[PDB]
A paper describes a structure:
Over all screens, a total of 31 out of 95 fragments are observed binding to FosAKP. For comparison, the same screen was conducted with conventional single crystal data collection at cryogenic temperatures (100 K) from loop-mounted crystals at beamline P11 at PETRA III. In total, 7 fragments bind in the two RT screens, of which 3 bind to pharmaceutically relevant sites 1, 2 and 4. In contrast, 31 fragments are observed binding in the cryo screens, but only 6 of these bind to the more interesting sites 1-4.
Residue numbers in the entry:
A (entry chain A), B (entry chain B): 1 to 137
The structure:
């Protein structure tokens, strides 16, 4: 059967600024870089950045809600979000509809998120403040 | 400090066929569903399906290379690929890299992959046969 996410691959329009964003700004671990891509890790996550001439820099109003959330502790969340804000990182959402989250964009407009909490914690919170029509299995 | 992927959220145009795809076809566990979304798990992966009127059913020629790969064992790979084929699931790429990979599309055209192999395995292969311009850290 399927056992988890093997890797996340993001198409990027310019390799160097994307590597800098994920490694320097977000603090992910850079393992390899070549003319057309890079491999990073974020804890157990394998992230690939793939240089793609088809990737467009996409404003958030032009893309759907597909997004990628990274885990951060309650102790680190606010200062990390504030550092991104002070660095001029663009945002895409303000309303906290799924808990403690900070919504921000990568250089190509990929929709990213910092989130505090697990799925179990989100289910427990939703039992008290459920989304409309919610059923739990 | 970021510690991993917290969740992957896919925007979907029709919630029922997307739930059927991820739960019934791909075997993920459905934890909750509401009028505009669902939460599933696949091992450690927290997957959210979010009903989004902005999601277009997108042909693979019209999207970039961003994609989401799920882990499967080598022993299970061929029968899972055959299950997807029986269900008429379209393929968007042939494998030409190390480790088994099956590249398939979800109902809205999200680019998915089954992959056998870790980052460590990929890096080992790359060290022996580096991509053009490849540098390691
Ligand atoms: C830091 C780094 C950069 C590059 C890009 N070098 C570009 C050189 S040129 C003269 O063609 O502009 C590759 C690997 C690492 Br690691
Ligand atoms: Mn989210
Ligand atoms: Mn891949």
């Amino acid at each position: 059967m399927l056992s988890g996410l093997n890797h996340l691959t993001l198409a990027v329009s310019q390799l160097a600024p994307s590597v800098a964003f994920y490694q320097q700004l977000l603090g992910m671990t850079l393992h390899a870089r070549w003319d057309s891509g890079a491999y990073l890790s974020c804890g157990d996550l394998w992230l690939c950045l793939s240089l793609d001439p088809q990737r467009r820099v996409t404003p958030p109003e032009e893309s759907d809600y597909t997004h990628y959330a990274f885990s951060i502790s309650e102790a680190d969340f606010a200062s990390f979000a504030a550092r991104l804000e002070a660095a001029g990182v663009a945002v895409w959402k303000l309303n906290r509809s799924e808990g403690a989250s900070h919504y921000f964009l990568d250089p190509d407009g990929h929709k990213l998120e910092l989130h505090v909490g697990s799925l179990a914690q989100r289910l427990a919170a939703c039992r008290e403040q459920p989304y409309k029509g919610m059923v739990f299995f």
